[PDB]
């Protein structure tokens, strides 16, 4: 299949990360992050959308602590606050970026309906043709750091991705997103940086610098 321009938007490991496709939809995403952030920054607007009795699977608006911007999120789990049983703690999945955070319900609002239009932008992927250097599954922190560096995750670095394989999703050991429960396979991709001067793509770079092993 054909190559596509992407950003790597979030990383768990080289075999679990998220991409956003660059194009009309990424421009619309950036615009939506702007509009949502402007909108939900007003208390009147937030009161138009006060959260009551949240539930798993609900799509909401939430503040991201690290940039004070508002994002679409899916409630993946809800548990009692252990200090404070009168409150809950929410496990959120940011549907357009792919990262997850635990959040207080005080930082969540109902999502204004027209913000649902744009399709969820983050696509979960794994890096094709690699496996961990640890064989006794887990990646060394140095390998994760290296992958984060090569992708420049969350710094808007254009990469070229190509889907070259698929694999079944592992059975879940934690609460997961509704989409991760639909039977859809995970795409395994080649990734390369058109701006780095290497002919090697990111898999081959990681393998030849001892950060990964070939499959």
């Amino acid at each position: 299949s054909k190559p596509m321009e992407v950003y790597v938007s979030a990383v768990a490991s080289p075999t679990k990360f998220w991409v956003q496709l660059i194009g009309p939809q990424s421009k619309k995403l950036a615009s939506m992050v702007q509009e949502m952030t402007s909108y939900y920054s007003s208390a009147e607007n937030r009161a138009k959308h006060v959260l009551t009795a949240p539930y798993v699977g609900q799509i909401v608006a939430a503040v991201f602590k690290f940039d004070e911007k508002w994002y679409r999120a899916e409630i993946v789990d809800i548990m009692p606050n252990q200090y404070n049983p009168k409150e809950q703690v929410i496990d959120l999945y940011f549907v357009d970026y792919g990262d997850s955070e635990y959040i207080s319900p005080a930082d969540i609002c109902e999502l204004r309906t027209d913000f649902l239009t744009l399709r969820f932008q983050a696509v979960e992927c794994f890096l094709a043709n690699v496996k961990s250097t640890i064989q006794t599954i887990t990646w060394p922190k140095s390998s994760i750091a290296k992958f984060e560096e090569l992708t420049e995750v969350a710094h808007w670095r254009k990469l070229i991705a190509r889907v070259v394989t698929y694999k079944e999703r592992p059975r879940a050991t934690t609460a997961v997103s509704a989409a991760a429960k639909e039977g859809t396979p995970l795409p395994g991709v080649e990734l390369f940086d058109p701006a780095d001067n290497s002919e090697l793509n990111i898999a081959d770079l990681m393998i030849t610098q001892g950060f990964a092993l070939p499959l």
Binding site: A12, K16, F17, D67, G98, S100, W139, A154
Partner: peptide, 9 residues
């Protein structure tokens, strides 16, 4: 467990 994605701009 290396299953949760992280974003740090």
């Amino acid at each position: 467990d290396q299953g949760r994605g992280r974003r740090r701009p």
